[PDB]
Write a structure and sequence with these properties.
The structure is cut from a larger assembly and holds two copies of chain A.
Chain A lengths: L13 E3 L2 E7 L18 E5 L18 E8 L3 H4 L2 E7 L5 E6 L2 E7 L5 E4 L9 E8 L26 H9 L20 E7 L2 E16 L5 E15 L3 E7 L5 E8 L4 E13 L9 E7 L4 H4 L5 E7 L4 E4 L2 E4 L2 E2 L2 E5 L13 H13 L4 E3 L7 H10 L2 E5 L7 H4 L2 H18 L5 E8 L9 H19 L6 E5 L16 E4 L11 H18 L3 E5 L18 H15 L5 E6 L30 H11 L8
Parallel strand pairs in A: 21-22, 21-28, 22-23, 23-24, 24-25, 25-26, 26-27, 27-28
Antiparallel strand pairs in A: 1-10, 2-3, 2-4, 4-9, 5-8, 5-10, 6-7, 6-9, 11-12, 12-15, 13-14, 13-16, 16-17, 18-19, 19-20
Helix pairs in contact in A: 4-5, 7-8, 9-10, 10-11
The structure holds a molecule of 2 linked components (BDP-SE2) (2 copies).
Chain lengths: ~625, ~625
């Protein structure tokens, strides 16, 4: 179950396989088997990592439906593979992939936003190796994220009662129809790499938890004592593992040698005196170095069999009444939902962009975001660990309704996504909360609200069982009839998406604020902490008015000014994450002006009027103690 | 019923009352009547003509609901009023007005897009006169154009099932909710003027018709003989009227003296040898000069006209016996600052753009336009489909006799005002009403519209074709559109349905074209298009890009070219225009092939090239 990010050290090496690959589009329902067994005929170039859709303007790959096939060759010195365990890792292949090496299927995966890997020790050979990866972009009623098997995309226009329209639909070209509001970018969206570990015995997983903090300082920078726990899992086959705790300067401040017991694990606790805590706006990271010792322990030899360096931060998270406590201090979220989205790359990971976006989060005086609507690339979490930005980590369970709740295949994929996200991400101190879905159907009459609850409650429990830190769990709720939804109010933090004054009461900020206050009165009675995870207004940079109407920069600024003045009056409202950080691509349609334009930044990360207004507001709101 | 545009001549003078007036906003359902008795307190400035909504950025007058009050003073020499009939004309007050002069209520008008006038001979006095005009902008289920009494504006987003939304609606500020897709600009949108006629007897109305053309030239520039008819109505009280026909150079080419009979009318026919005909792309105008006789002239009026016939014949639309093809668009009277206010600089520019595009026609979507625009199109050879403000209609309106009454007023009023223009070739009695469905609904719509079709025919002395512009609907259960003289359809295949899929859009369009092929009427587009933000570009153009709009017209027009019975392409729209705000309107309607500032998008260039190669006559 461990998926530690590949590391290079004295016992391990990583060989990236990124670069310009060969590529062919394939069929709507299948691809040629022979393409895995020999070089692709007449290949196109395709950079990896990246979405494929915007990498070829001769083709219309945004319209592609079905399979594509990637391929490349590689060779490595025999000297480096000898005696080692060889693993091929795919950080993400969106949505489903079949991976072949030298004409043999290594295996398959479903789930477009989480990593998977194969043991290729026996499949590799000397000299050039031929790696082929078939990737399927199709979405439908059984995928996460969810597609529509017929009709229109989410937020699509129709005239379904016109006989000519009904007839033309029957014969129209097959297309993915997202039941979600972001473009279905597909392909090898994240890195590919070959890596090595020792074969006889190796470190397979590490979990670090902050179990307890004693006498936390007034400023939350330190605690008199921190109790941390480690759990190390091994693969392979009186053995021991040395655990060293390094502080921010790399000095060993704690260390223990633990017995490995059988499935093989070592676990224990370590007390850290005068512990330096991790906080939003004030990151501090330690490293847990795990070193597998040879048979005979340190008593017999100085050599190290295997090693892995796991970053971690010491901090607690606790929901208490209507507060969200980090290191016992009442936190207030400032930020937004994001997307992994950019020109050229699509959903492809881009660390230049991640580094820039983290600086923009600081420029705005924001302190947090949500990984709307899928787990992000691993590097972004490491960056937010070092930069003191809090994350709500969310699985790709977007577009769901009652059709999905009855389907065992969907429930299995949903559990896989929750387990996989938490297994990948559990050691990040920046992650303070898990989201098990975005905007599923929860309300209505008859049995529908109960059916939704019965689907989601076990997933809430799974997210708690899976996280060794036991962080809060939420479900991000779409604008709905909050009085018949019986699921959202059971979450640990209530996370609501609301578009009062945009999708309803349009343009009337007085009415919008009145409606918002009626719903806030409902949440006030429930007595849980509540935050916005979405609210906003599509905004075309450069459209201006003295009395700003919808789509103007002024309306977007006025929107936030009015709504935020209302939530400031509620002590139990513990965060404001708006929609969205930046404009992003969507399926085309009559309400999407070259995608979603609710960004406070443009797609090129330039600030609209509302961004300047929010920057000034957020400059004056502290991370702790605002409420 | 005559509403001849005010003229100055030896017998008549016009005194314009345009300029910067005083202005105050008033209440949702009332205004202070006493404001007519003294200068408005603390007035704002307000230019007339113009909509008021965009003339004050300290206020949000786009949000205004109810009444406003205009006022100004004027004085004219006693010498000018002596012995004359004094008439105060409002070219348009949108939507309803109460008019006072020196504190006396002259009367009221309902209907925001047609002229009305008052005899103020007795209310005028020497020196300064105080003119107060209260204007009501309210629209609702009994007005034309139609407003919604509750819910949202047309094409508005909602979450009606959210309890907080339902409750907030109950208490929200009252607003007009258009059931139409253009902003509800209000105020004194067109000119105001005082004018004079003789009092004892005067010319009240003139109708000129083209009755028959003999031996029309191959190129339709002339006919060996044209038989025209005149009908002159008089007001006041063996009298006679002199009718002189002036050609384009002002030469009197024909003349007759007719007896006036009592209701007081003179009528007759005149034969014009080697008549110069009016054609799209080749205007020629005559003037009929009517002079009431006692060397003296008692009264006079100069009525421009053009000699031409219009005939629907099978699946053809014949102008002077030639098969015409419409190229053009729906327009709007819409611009920055002015709103719906008439602007003849803009009208002159727009007519030049119609020529730049090689278009030949437009429709007055969705209300009669200012009179000056029709005069301009008369002289510039641009054909017009003239439409009343019956937009936003459905079964709630058809059951309401007040709406039918207003609809009849609008049809009679438009045709009475506009009947003499040669550029007008067809009348439209509605845009996008509800016509389809189950049960009694299609028959109820037909029973409502058929008498209005008959009224438009009865009212027009030229007996021009009459249509009803149909919104995308279930054409198989609509039983009304197919009975019109020309079938005029608004279709948005590939935009509002089959979105972005031009192959599917063309397949669907062709299925509906197969339906119309069997009906056997002439058919044309009056709307089709795609919102387009200038500057948004793609190599594979998606919705809102300039390329998608160009590709849209390229694909759709290739299909209608294959149908010989499809006699015109009027797209939506000439230029981007203002609407009520909402999630599908990016600062208004962006289906213009031109921007709101009349700059050409990619599609405008593509259409210009297409239209350059399509002749006015004989394309099909
Ligand atoms: O609409 C967006 O910009 C985002 O919408 C979110 O889901 C919601 C959509 C609607 C639509 C109509 C009325 C109320 C709504 O409230 C919502 O909460 C979605 O989570 C985002 O991914 C979309 O981008
Ligand atoms: O939508 C417009 O741009 C114009 O719409 C016209 O009416 C129609 C609206 C719709 C909506 C959805 C599907 C099909 C439609 O077909 C129509 O004909 C209206 O005549 C114009 O005034 C609008 O601006």
């Amino acid at each position: 179950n461990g998926m530690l990010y590949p590391q290079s050290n004295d016992s391990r090496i990583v060989f990236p396989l990124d670069g310009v690959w060969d590529f062919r589009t394939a069929g709507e329902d299948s691809y040629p088997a022979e393409w895995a067994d020999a070089p692709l005929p007449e290949p196109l170039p395709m950079a990896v990592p990246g979405s494929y859709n915007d990498q070829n303007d001769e083709l219309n790959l945004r319209a592609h439906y079905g399979w594509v096939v990637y391929q490349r060759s590689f060779a490595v010195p025999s000297r480096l593979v000898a005696g080692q365990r060889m693993i091929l890792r795919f950080d993400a292949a969106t949505h489903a992939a079949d991976v072949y090496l030298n004409g043999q299927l290594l295996g398959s995966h479903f789930g477009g936003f989480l990593p998977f890997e194969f043991d290729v020790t026996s499949a590799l050979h000397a000299g050039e190796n031929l790696l082929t990866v078939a990737v399927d972009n199709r979405i439908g009623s059984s995928t996460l994220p969810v597609g529509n098997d017929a009709g229109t995309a989410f937020m699509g226009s129709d005239n379904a009662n016109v006989p000519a329209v009904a007839e033309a639909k029957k014969h129209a070209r097959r297309q993915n129809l997202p039941n979600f509001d972001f473009f279905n970018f597909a392909g090898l969206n994240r890195h590919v790499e070959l890596y090595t570990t020792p074969a006889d015995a190796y470190i397979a997983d590490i979990a670090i938890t902050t179990e307890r903090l004693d006498h936390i300082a007034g400023d939350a920078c330190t605690a008199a004592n921190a109790l941390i726990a480690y759990d190390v899992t091994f693969g392979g086959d009186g053995r021991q593992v040395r655990i060293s705790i390094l502080d921010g300067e790399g000095t060993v401040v704690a260390g223990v040698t633990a017995d490995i017991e059988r499935t093989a694990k070592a676990s224990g606790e370590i007390a850290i005196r005068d512990a330096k805590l991790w906080n939003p706006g004030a990151a501090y990271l330690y490293t847990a170095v795990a070193e597998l010792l040879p048979e005979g322990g340190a008593e017999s030899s100085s050599r190290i069999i295997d090693a892995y360096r796991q970053t971690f931060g010491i901090r607690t998270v606790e929901v208490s009444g209507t507060t969200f406590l980090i290191n016992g201090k009442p936190f207030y979220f400032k930020g937004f939902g994001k997307h992994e989205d950019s020109y050229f790359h699509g959903r492809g990971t881009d660390d230049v962009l991640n580094v820039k976006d983290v600086s923009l989060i600081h420029w705005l005086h924001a302190n947090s975001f949500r990984t709307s609507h899928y787990p992000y690339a691993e590097s972004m979490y490491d960056l937010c660990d070092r930069e003191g930005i809090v994350i709500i980590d969310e699985v790709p369970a977007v577009g769901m309704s009652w059709l999905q709740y009855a389907n065992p295949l969907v429930a299995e994929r949903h559990r896989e996504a929750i387990r996989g996200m938490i297994a990948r991400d559990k050691n990040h101190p920046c992650i303070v909360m898990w989201s098990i879905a975005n905007a599923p159907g929860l309300d209505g009459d008859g049995e529908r609200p109960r059916q939704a609850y019965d689907y989601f409650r076990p997933l809430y429990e799974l997210a708690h069982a899976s996280d060794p830190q036991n962080r809060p769990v939420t479900l991000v709720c779409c604008q709905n009839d909050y009085t018949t939804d019986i699921t959202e109010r059971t979450m640990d933090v209530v996370c609501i998406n609301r578009y009062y004054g945009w999708y309803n009461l349009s343009g009337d900020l007085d009415a919008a604020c009145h409606a918002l206050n009626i719903e806030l009165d409902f949440w006030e009675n429930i007595g849980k902490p509540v935050m916005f995870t979405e609210y906003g207004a599509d905004t075309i940079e450069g459209i201006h008015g003295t009395h700003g109407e919808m789509f103007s920069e002024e309306f977007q600024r006025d929107y936030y000014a009015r709504i935020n003045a209302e939530i400031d009056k509620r002590p139990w409202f513990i965060g404001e994450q708006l929609w969205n950080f930046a404009d992003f691509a969507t399926f085309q349609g009559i309400i999407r002006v070259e995608g979603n334009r609710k960004g406070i930044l443009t797609r090129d990360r330039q600030p609209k009027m509302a961004a300047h207004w929010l920057r000034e507001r957020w400059a004056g709101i502290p991370d702790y103690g605002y409420k």
